[PDB]
Amino acid sequence: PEFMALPHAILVSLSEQASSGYELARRFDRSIGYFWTATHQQIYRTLRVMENNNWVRATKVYAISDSGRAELARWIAEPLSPTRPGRGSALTDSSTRDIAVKLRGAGYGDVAALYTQVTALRAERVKSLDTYRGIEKRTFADPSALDGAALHQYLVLRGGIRAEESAIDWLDEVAEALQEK
Amino acid sequence: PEFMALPHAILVSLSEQASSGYELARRFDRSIGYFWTATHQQIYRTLRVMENNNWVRATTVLQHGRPDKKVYAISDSGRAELARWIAEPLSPTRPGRGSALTDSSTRDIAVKLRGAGYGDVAALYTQVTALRAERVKSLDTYRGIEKRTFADPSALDGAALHQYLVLRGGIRAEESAIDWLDEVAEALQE
Ligand SMILES: [Cl-]
């Protein structure tokens, strides 16, 4: 439960607005829904799980508990996981999504701890890009002579190259805005 | 289900090189694993399935003083299915359709783009231009939420600024997607 990311997304939702099961889903599919693709069945299942830890109270409207608000602070401060599923690419790495959740509910949990996660993740995107940048020069040196399969592969690599750059650029925009704060 | 996403990725993979179990897993991670997170167990289970469909054929190759390796290659029927799936339009019922961060058409197009060929590129260009038209809907929407809710983002503090930054990530992704979708469309224009 504390090693997953949806309980926490819902903890953010509850932190801002204490809603119900359906009100929660409804709220989630337009607030955090643009980064997380979760179903109503998932939202409800996790809401059950959160009441099992006493993370949410039965005020029928759910409320974040003290224990749940503590977990959000804990989770936001918790650094980058080495066991995280998808390490090594901006398209597969789920940290970009987690940072967005942490960034939203940065009331519970502090900005200093998150800043370091933003700078740590950016450093990883540089390893990713530096890898892609190597495959480019060492596989697609002179990118104008490419014809069919070779060019299709280049273009695909160029999508990954863009994503890595995109991630770094956002991570920079995030890191900049968290400094002036 | 048969005609899902991973099988076609594996057809594209085996289209590039006839690989064995481990070779296919290894080379998928090296290439298509940078956009696709799939487990080796999953890769092999689809391999089994597509052999039952006769989409892939297995040949035991002779290795001296080596366990003889079983190599899978794409068959005629599988080569046909890959061509069929590249041509098949985007689903209007698929999830996360409303965001570049949430949409898997970006990934499907990448796979299609890999194993395209002279005959499939034309139909593939169709989906490129269609998906770009959707990213503009998504972008046009985010830019609306920006102007309506986050005009003058210099006087933003705390929650408001955190939310804007998050919205700023979505705008970049849509832009990024459009830029790539344009680069692909242009490179096919020759
Ligand atoms: Cl055959």
Coordinates of C-alpha atoms and ligand atoms in Angstrom, one line a residue:
Chain A
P1 CA 0.0 0.0 0.0
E2 CA 2.8 2.5 0.9
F3 CA 4.9 1.2 -2.1
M4 CA 2.1 1.9 -4.6
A5 CA 1.1 5.3 -6.0
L6 CA -2.7 5.3 -6.3
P7 CA -3.5 5.4 -2.5
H8 CA -1.3 8.5 -2.4
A9 CA -3.0 10.1 -5.4
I10 CA -6.3 9.6 -3.6
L11 CA -4.8 10.9 -0.4
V12 CA -4.0 14.1 -2.2
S13 CA -7.6 14.3 -3.6
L14 CA -9.0 13.8 -0.1
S15 CA -6.5 16.3 1.4
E16 CA -8.0 19.0 -0.9
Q17 CA -11.6 17.9 -1.0
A18 CA -13.2 15.2 1.2
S19 CA -15.5 13.5 -1.2
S20 CA -17.3 10.1 -1.5
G21 CA -16.6 7.0 -3.5
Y22 CA -18.3 8.2 -6.7
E23 CA -17.5 11.9 -6.0
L24 CA -13.9 10.8 -5.6
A25 CA -13.8 8.9 -8.9
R26 CA -15.7 11.8 -10.6
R27 CA -13.2 14.3 -9.1
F28 CA -10.2 12.1 -10.0
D29 CA -11.0 11.7 -13.6
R30 CA -10.7 15.4 -14.3
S31 CA -8.1 16.6 -11.7
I32 CA -5.4 13.9 -11.6
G33 CA -7.0 11.9 -14.5
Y34 CA -4.7 13.5 -17.2
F35 CA -1.6 11.8 -15.8
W36 CA -3.1 8.6 -14.2
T37 CA -5.4 6.3 -16.1
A38 CA -7.4 4.6 -13.3
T39 CA -10.9 3.1 -13.3
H40 CA -13.7 3.5 -10.8
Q41 CA -13.3 -0.2 -9.7
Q42 CA -9.6 0.5 -8.9
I43 CA -10.4 3.8 -7.0
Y44 CA -13.0 2.0 -4.7
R45 CA -10.8 -1.0 -4.1
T46 CA -7.9 1.2 -2.9
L47 CA -10.4 3.2 -0.8
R48 CA -11.3 0.0 1.0
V49 CA -7.5 -0.6 1.5
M50 CA -7.0 2.9 2.9
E51 CA -9.7 2.4 5.6
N52 CA -7.9 -0.8 6.6
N53 CA -4.9 1.3 7.7
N54 CA -7.3 3.9 9.1
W55 CA -5.8 6.3 6.4
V56 CA -9.4 7.4 5.5
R57 CA -12.3 7.9 7.9
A58 CA -16.0 7.3 7.4
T59 CA -17.3 10.8 7.9
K60 CA -21.2 8.5 3.3
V61 CA -18.1 10.8 2.8
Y62 CA -14.5 9.7 3.3
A63 CA -12.0 11.9 5.1
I64 CA -8.2 11.7 5.2
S65 CA -7.1 10.7 8.7
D66 CA -4.1 12.0 10.7
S67 CA -2.5 8.6 9.9
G68 CA -3.3 9.1 6.2
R69 CA -2.0 12.7 6.2
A70 CA 1.2 11.4 7.8
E71 CA 1.6 8.8 5.1
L72 CA 1.2 11.5 2.4
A73 CA 4.0 13.5 4.1
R74 CA 6.1 10.4 4.4
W75 CA 5.5 9.3 0.9
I76 CA 6.3 12.7 -0.6
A77 CA 9.6 12.8 1.4
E78 CA 10.4 9.2 0.5
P79 CA 13.1 9.5 -2.3
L80 CA 13.4 7.8 -5.7
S81 CA 12.9 4.0 -5.5
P82 CA 15.5 1.7 -7.0
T83 CA 12.8 -1.0 -7.3
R84 CA 10.6 1.5 -9.2
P85 CA 9.0 -0.2 -12.2
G86 CA 10.1 1.2 -15.5
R87 CA 13.6 2.8 -14.7
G88 CA 15.7 3.8 -17.7
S89 CA 13.2 5.7 -20.0
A90 CA 10.9 8.7 -19.9
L91 CA 8.3 6.7 -21.7
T92 CA 8.4 3.8 -19.2
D93 CA 9.5 5.5 -16.0
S94 CA 6.7 6.3 -13.7
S95 CA 8.5 8.8 -11.6
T96 CA 7.4 11.6 -13.9
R97 CA 3.8 10.8 -12.9
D98 CA 4.6 10.4 -9.2
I99 CA 6.4 13.8 -9.1
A100 CA 3.2 15.3 -10.5
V101 CA 1.2 13.8 -7.6
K102 CA 3.8 14.9 -5.0
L103 CA 3.9 18.3 -6.6
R104 CA 0.2 18.8 -6.2
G105 CA -0.3 17.8 -2.6
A106 CA 3.0 19.5 -1.5
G107 CA 1.0 20.8 1.5
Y108 CA 1.3 17.5 3.2
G109 CA 5.0 16.7 2.7
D110 CA 7.6 19.4 2.1
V111 CA 9.1 21.0 -1.1
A112 CA 12.7 20.5 -0.1
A113 CA 12.4 16.7 -0.1
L114 CA 10.6 16.8 -3.4
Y115 CA 13.2 19.2 -5.0
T116 CA 15.9 16.6 -4.5
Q117 CA 13.7 14.0 -6.2
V118 CA 13.2 16.4 -9.2
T119 CA 17.0 16.9 -9.4
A120 CA 17.7 13.2 -8.9
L121 CA 15.2 12.2 -11.7
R122 CA 16.6 14.9 -14.0
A123 CA 20.0 13.3 -13.6
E124 CA 18.6 10.0 -14.6
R125 CA 17.0 11.4 -17.8
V126 CA 20.5 12.7 -18.7
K127 CA 21.8 9.1 -18.5
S128 CA 18.8 8.0 -20.6
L129 CA 19.4 10.8 -23.2
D130 CA 23.2 10.3 -23.1
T131 CA 22.5 6.6 -24.0
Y132 CA 20.2 7.6 -26.8
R133 CA 22.6 10.2 -28.0
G134 CA 25.2 7.5 -28.2
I135 CA 23.0 5.1 -30.3
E136 CA 22.3 8.1 -32.6
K137 CA 25.9 8.9 -33.4
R138 CA 27.0 5.3 -33.3
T139 CA 24.1 3.9 -35.3
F140 CA 22.7 6.8 -37.3
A141 CA 25.7 8.9 -38.1
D142 CA 24.7 11.1 -41.1
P143 CA 20.9 11.0 -40.7
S144 CA 20.1 11.9 -44.4
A145 CA 21.0 8.7 -46.1
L146 CA 18.2 6.7 -44.3
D147 CA 15.7 4.9 -46.5
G148 CA 13.2 2.5 -45.0
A149 CA 13.6 0.3 -41.9
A150 CA 16.7 2.2 -41.0
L151 CA 14.9 5.6 -41.1
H152 CA 11.8 4.2 -39.3
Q153 CA 14.2 3.1 -36.5
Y154 CA 15.8 6.5 -36.5
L155 CA 12.5 8.3 -36.2
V156 CA 11.5 6.0 -33.3
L157 CA 14.8 6.8 -31.5
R158 CA 14.0 10.5 -32.2
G159 CA 10.7 10.1 -30.2
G160 CA 12.6 8.7 -27.2
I161 CA 15.2 11.5 -27.6
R162 CA 12.4 14.1 -27.6
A163 CA 10.7 12.6 -24.5
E164 CA 14.0 12.6 -22.6
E165 CA 14.5 16.3 -23.5
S166 CA 10.9 17.0 -22.7
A167 CA 11.2 15.4 -19.2
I168 CA 14.5 17.3 -18.4
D169 CA 12.9 20.6 -19.5
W170 CA 9.8 20.1 -17.3
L171 CA 12.0 18.9 -14.4
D172 CA 14.0 22.1 -14.9
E173 CA 10.9 24.2 -14.9
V174 CA 9.8 22.4 -11.8
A175 CA 13.2 22.7 -10.1
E176 CA 13.4 26.4 -10.9
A177 CA 9.9 27.2 -9.6
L178 CA 10.7 25.3 -6.4
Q179 CA 13.9 27.4 -5.7
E180 CA 12.2 30.8 -5.8
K181 CA 9.5 29.3 -3.4
Chain B
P1 CA -8.1 -11.8 -27.3
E2 CA -5.4 -12.5 -30.1
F3 CA -5.2 -9.1 -31.8
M4 CA -3.9 -7.0 -28.9
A5 CA -0.8 -4.7 -28.7
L6 CA 2.1 -6.9 -27.5
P7 CA 1.8 -9.7 -30.1
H8 CA 2.2 -7.1 -32.9
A9 CA 5.2 -5.6 -31.2
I10 CA 6.7 -9.1 -31.2
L11 CA 5.8 -9.5 -34.9
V12 CA 7.7 -6.3 -35.6
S13 CA 10.6 -7.6 -33.5
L14 CA 10.7 -11.0 -35.2
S15 CA 10.3 -9.2 -38.5
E16 CA 13.6 -7.5 -37.9
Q17 CA 15.4 -10.6 -36.8
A18 CA 14.4 -14.3 -36.3
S19 CA 15.2 -14.6 -32.6
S20 CA 15.0 -17.4 -30.0
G21 CA 13.2 -17.1 -26.6
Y22 CA 16.1 -15.3 -24.8
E23 CA 17.2 -13.4 -28.0
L24 CA 13.7 -12.1 -28.5
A25 CA 13.4 -11.0 -24.8
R26 CA 16.8 -9.5 -24.9
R27 CA 16.4 -7.5 -28.1
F28 CA 12.9 -6.4 -27.2
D29 CA 14.2 -4.7 -24.0
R30 CA 17.1 -3.2 -26.0
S31 CA 14.8 -1.7 -28.7
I32 CA 11.0 -1.7 -28.0
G33 CA 11.4 -1.8 -24.2
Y34 CA 12.3 1.9 -24.2
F35 CA 8.6 2.6 -25.0
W36 CA 7.0 -0.7 -24.0
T37 CA 7.2 -2.2 -20.5
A38 CA 6.6 -5.9 -21.0
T39 CA 7.9 -8.8 -18.9
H40 CA 9.9 -11.7 -20.4
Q41 CA 7.2 -14.2 -19.2
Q42 CA 4.6 -12.2 -21.1
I43 CA 6.8 -12.0 -24.2
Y44 CA 7.0 -15.8 -24.2
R45 CA 3.3 -16.4 -23.5
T46 CA 2.4 -14.3 -26.6
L47 CA 5.1 -16.2 -28.5
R48 CA 3.4 -19.5 -27.6
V49 CA 0.0 -18.0 -28.6
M50 CA 1.2 -16.7 -32.0
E51 CA 2.7 -20.1 -32.8
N52 CA -0.8 -21.6 -32.2
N53 CA -2.1 -18.9 -34.7
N54 CA 0.7 -19.9 -37.0
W55 CA 1.8 -16.2 -37.0
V56 CA 5.3 -17.4 -36.0
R57 CA 7.1 -20.6 -36.9
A58 CA 9.8 -22.3 -34.7
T59 CA 13.0 -23.8 -36.2
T60 CA 15.5 -25.8 -34.2
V61 CA 18.9 -24.6 -35.4
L62 CA 22.0 -26.9 -35.1
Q63 CA 24.6 -25.7 -32.6
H64 CA 27.6 -28.0 -32.0
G65 CA 28.6 -28.4 -28.4
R66 CA 25.7 -26.1 -27.6
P67 CA 22.0 -26.7 -26.6
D68 CA 20.4 -26.5 -30.1
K69 CA 18.5 -23.3 -30.2
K70 CA 14.8 -22.9 -31.2
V71 CA 14.4 -19.9 -33.4
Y72 CA 11.1 -18.2 -34.1
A73 CA 10.5 -16.3 -37.3
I74 CA 7.4 -14.4 -38.6
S75 CA 5.4 -16.4 -41.0
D76 CA 3.4 -15.4 -44.1
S77 CA 0.2 -15.2 -42.1
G78 CA 1.9 -13.2 -39.4
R79 CA 3.4 -10.8 -41.9
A80 CA -0.1 -10.3 -43.2
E81 CA -1.5 -9.6 -39.8
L82 CA 1.2 -7.0 -39.1
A83 CA 0.3 -5.3 -42.4
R84 CA -3.4 -5.5 -41.4
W85 CA -2.7 -4.0 -37.9
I86 CA -0.5 -1.1 -39.3
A87 CA -3.4 -0.2 -41.6
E88 CA -6.1 -0.6 -38.9
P89 CA -7.3 2.9 -37.7
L90 CA -6.9 4.2 -34.1
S91 CA -9.5 3.0 -31.6
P92 CA -12.1 5.7 -30.4
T93 CA -12.9 3.6 -27.4
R94 CA -9.3 3.2 -26.0
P95 CA -8.4 4.8 -22.6
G96 CA -6.4 8.0 -22.0
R97 CA -7.3 9.0 -25.5
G98 CA -7.4 12.6 -24.2
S99 CA -3.7 13.1 -23.3
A100 CA -0.3 12.4 -24.7
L101 CA 0.7 11.2 -21.2
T102 CA -2.2 8.9 -21.0
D103 CA -2.6 7.8 -24.7
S104 CA -1.0 4.6 -26.1
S105 CA -1.5 5.5 -29.7
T106 CA 1.9 7.2 -29.5
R107 CA 3.4 3.8 -28.7
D108 CA 1.3 1.9 -31.3
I109 CA 2.5 4.4 -34.0
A110 CA 6.1 3.8 -33.0
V111 CA 5.6 0.0 -33.4
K112 CA 3.7 0.5 -36.7
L113 CA 6.5 2.9 -37.9
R114 CA 9.1 0.2 -37.2
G115 CA 7.7 -2.6 -39.2
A116 CA 6.0 -0.5 -41.9
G117 CA 7.3 -1.3 -45.4
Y118 CA 6.6 0.3 -48.7
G119 CA 2.9 -0.8 -48.8
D120 CA 1.9 0.1 -45.2
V121 CA 3.5 3.6 -44.9
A122 CA 0.6 5.2 -46.8
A123 CA -2.0 4.0 -44.3
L124 CA 0.4 4.7 -41.4
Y125 CA 0.6 8.3 -42.5
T126 CA -3.1 8.4 -42.1
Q127 CA -2.9 7.6 -38.4
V128 CA -0.1 10.0 -38.0
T129 CA -2.2 12.9 -39.2
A130 CA -5.3 11.8 -37.4
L131 CA -3.4 11.5 -34.0
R132 CA -1.8 14.9 -34.5
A133 CA -5.3 16.3 -34.9
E134 CA -6.2 14.9 -31.6
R135 CA -3.1 16.2 -29.8
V136 CA -4.2 19.7 -30.9
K137 CA -7.6 19.1 -29.4
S138 CA -5.8 18.1 -26.2
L139 CA -3.4 21.0 -26.4
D140 CA -6.1 23.5 -27.4
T141 CA -8.0 22.4 -24.3
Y142 CA -5.0 22.7 -21.9
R143 CA -4.3 26.2 -23.3
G144 CA -7.9 27.0 -22.5
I145 CA -7.6 25.8 -18.9
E146 CA -4.4 27.8 -18.7
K147 CA -5.9 31.1 -19.8
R148 CA -9.1 30.5 -17.9
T149 CA -7.4 29.5 -14.6
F150 CA -3.7 30.4 -14.7
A151 CA -3.4 33.8 -16.4
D152 CA -0.5 35.8 -14.7
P153 CA 1.3 32.8 -13.3
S154 CA 3.9 35.1 -11.6
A155 CA 1.5 35.8 -8.7
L156 CA 1.0 32.0 -8.2
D157 CA 1.9 30.5 -4.8
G158 CA 1.8 27.0 -3.4
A159 CA -1.0 24.8 -4.5
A160 CA -1.9 27.0 -7.5
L161 CA 1.6 27.1 -8.8
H162 CA 2.1 23.4 -8.2
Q163 CA -1.0 22.6 -10.2
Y164 CA 0.1 24.9 -13.0
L165 CA 3.5 23.2 -13.2
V166 CA 1.6 19.9 -13.6
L167 CA -0.5 21.5 -16.3
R168 CA 2.7 22.8 -17.9
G169 CA 3.9 19.2 -18.1
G170 CA 0.8 18.2 -20.1
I171 CA 1.2 21.1 -22.5
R172 CA 4.8 20.1 -23.1
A173 CA 3.9 16.5 -23.8
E174 CA 1.2 17.5 -26.3
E175 CA 3.6 19.9 -28.0
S176 CA 6.3 17.2 -27.9
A177 CA 4.0 14.6 -29.4
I178 CA 2.9 17.1 -32.1
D179 CA 6.5 17.9 -32.9
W180 CA 7.4 14.2 -33.2
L181 CA 4.2 13.4 -35.1
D182 CA 5.2 16.1 -37.6
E183 CA 8.8 14.9 -37.9
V184 CA 7.5 11.5 -38.8
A185 CA 4.9 12.8 -41.3
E186 CA 7.6 14.9 -42.9
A187 CA 10.2 12.1 -43.2
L188 CA 7.5 10.0 -44.9
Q189 CA 6.7 12.9 -47.3
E190 CA 9.8 11.8 -49.3
Ligands
CL1 CL 3.9 -20.5 -43.1

